[PDB]
């Protein structure tokens, strides 16, 4: 616990709650430093709920909608992993340093501007803060501190969701992080063209083509191993290797970035709620020098970086460049440098890495049992036993990637398309959830419209979703603009957040701007656009044939009329069901 780095933030919080501040001698924190406590003080989308009655009795759908916060913390966040051996550490540094240099070959780091940040907040209480000059003054005071060598307010607010913990920060802390490290996103350092293995900037509509491209590279099976709680396994050594990017920055920019890396990444201070007696609630103040603070501006890019480093190392272990003697200490580094310069880029191209999600196509199946460095780095695989060899896939269409699987389908004319797919319950369940209280029928209907148009663009091949989306679009006024967000994923490019005709938008995305679509002939009607095969639609959770779903479909126009009565019969509506 570096008090000379975290003390100022702790004193600032203590001053703001001096009368209630206490030190709970019986706090539950084991692997987090405890500093003290103080006395601190979802909804359904009715439109989507009304048009999806068969999914009220489906637990896979309804399940999506301080006691719960502490549960997530004690189980997956309050853990400590042993440090990797010295040789593992030298290998991680060497590959990270090689990777930053490859990524920086055709790109130079740069500072991101106040106006770039504002153009971002206007694109996606929140909008009023950047328009107020008092916010930019607080930002300026915190930057002053950062350049001197201190931090007062870059403090996290942790919210547990019972699965994962989401770490919040005030808009000001995120602007400062964006200013110094946002260039990784804005300039696509993790884009496929620049990184080889990255997929940043590609929509879910292109990810299948990436996997299909990888399936054609000679080698072993495709491996898609998830790491159990990736963000909680980011070690202090991963953070120092990620911060090597500062060596490519000019002094001024370097000072801003080193401050972010020191206070937001490497010496975190966090506020967390905890249930107290007589229904009362406390806020604890805790600190940690490792783990990823999930939900931060460059979380995705940095996770992508470290994941590419982990897969290059696993491939080096598999190819026998690294042996079990290299874990304890790496005596000769020359073999690693030679493997990176000769094979580095070829191995990057055999990967698709999106944050903590990866698919690797190795040169043979020795990759399945190359686990010694993977386990020494603390990157333990999900659900499987630590030393049980990984199971790879033969069919790229069955490979999991970004919570999806990809399928080749055929248009009525014979052209093939590669579509994203996932279990329907997850999609319907997510669309039934509305974030925000006091929500007007307009905002709820507009969010419903965004979900329906997203389904039309990406999940058009699911029979239930095509029907449900058309009923939503028939119940919401035509001129009402879609609002909100249907996903947090960087693969959600929001082409559906528009009032442009969805068949025109489908054509732009699947035909015109699809490089994997050779023949550019437009598709002029929805019936030309295919569904999955009944067996596959059923496997991924379809209710086609199921009695309540059939009644739902038979009564759908009546249901649409009821929603139109509630929104208002004076509004203008289009019938997308006919
Ligand atoms: Zn700060
Ligand atoms: Zn599927």
From Swiss-Prot:
Catalytic activity: a 5'-end (5'-triphosphoguanosine)-ribonucleoside in mRNA + S-adenosyl-L-methionine = a 5'-end (N(7)-methyl 5'-triphosphoguanosine)-ribonucleoside in mRNA + S-adenosyl-L-homocysteine; a 5'-end (N(7)-methyl 5'-triphosphoguanosine)-ribonucleoside in mRNA + S-adenosyl-L-methionine = a 5'-end (N(7)-methyl 5'-triphosphoguanosine)-(2'-O-methyl-ribonucleoside) in mRNA + S-adenosyl-L-homocysteine + H(+)
Domain RdRp catalytic: start-end pairs: 220-370
Free-text note on domains in this protein's UniProt record: Comprises a methyltransferase (MTase) in the N-terminal region and an RNA-dependent RNA polymerase in the C-terminal region.
Binding-site residues for Zn(2+) 1, renumbered to this chain: 142, 146, 151, 154
Native source organism of the sequence: Zika virus (isolate ZIKV/Human/French Polynesia/10087PF/2013) (ZIKV)
Protein name: RNA-directed RNA polymerase NS5
High-level lineage: Viruses, Riboviria, Orthornavirae, Kitrinoviricota, Flasuviricetes
Subunit structure: Homodimer; dimerization may negatively regulate the GTase activity, a crucial step in the capping process. Interacts with host STAT2; this interaction inhibits the phosphorylation of the latter, and, when all viral proteins are present (polyprotein), targets STAT2 for degradation. Interacts with host TBK1 and IKBKE; these interactions lead to the inhibition of the host RIG-I signaling pathway. Interacts with host PAF1 complex; the interaction may prevent the recruitment of the host PAF1 complex to interferon-responsive genes, and thus reduces the immune response.
Lipid bilayer topology: Peripheral membrane protein
Residue numbers covered by motif Nuclear localization signal (NLS): 105-111
Function comment: Replicates the viral (+) and (-) RNA genome, and performs the capping of genomes in the cytoplasm. Once sufficient NS5 is expressed, binds to the cap-proximal structure and inhibits further translation of the viral genome. Besides its role in RNA genome replication, also prevents the establishment of a cellular antiviral state by blocking the interferon-alpha/beta (IFN-alpha/beta) signaling pathway.
Subcellular location(s) per record: Host endoplasmic reticulum membrane; Host nucleus
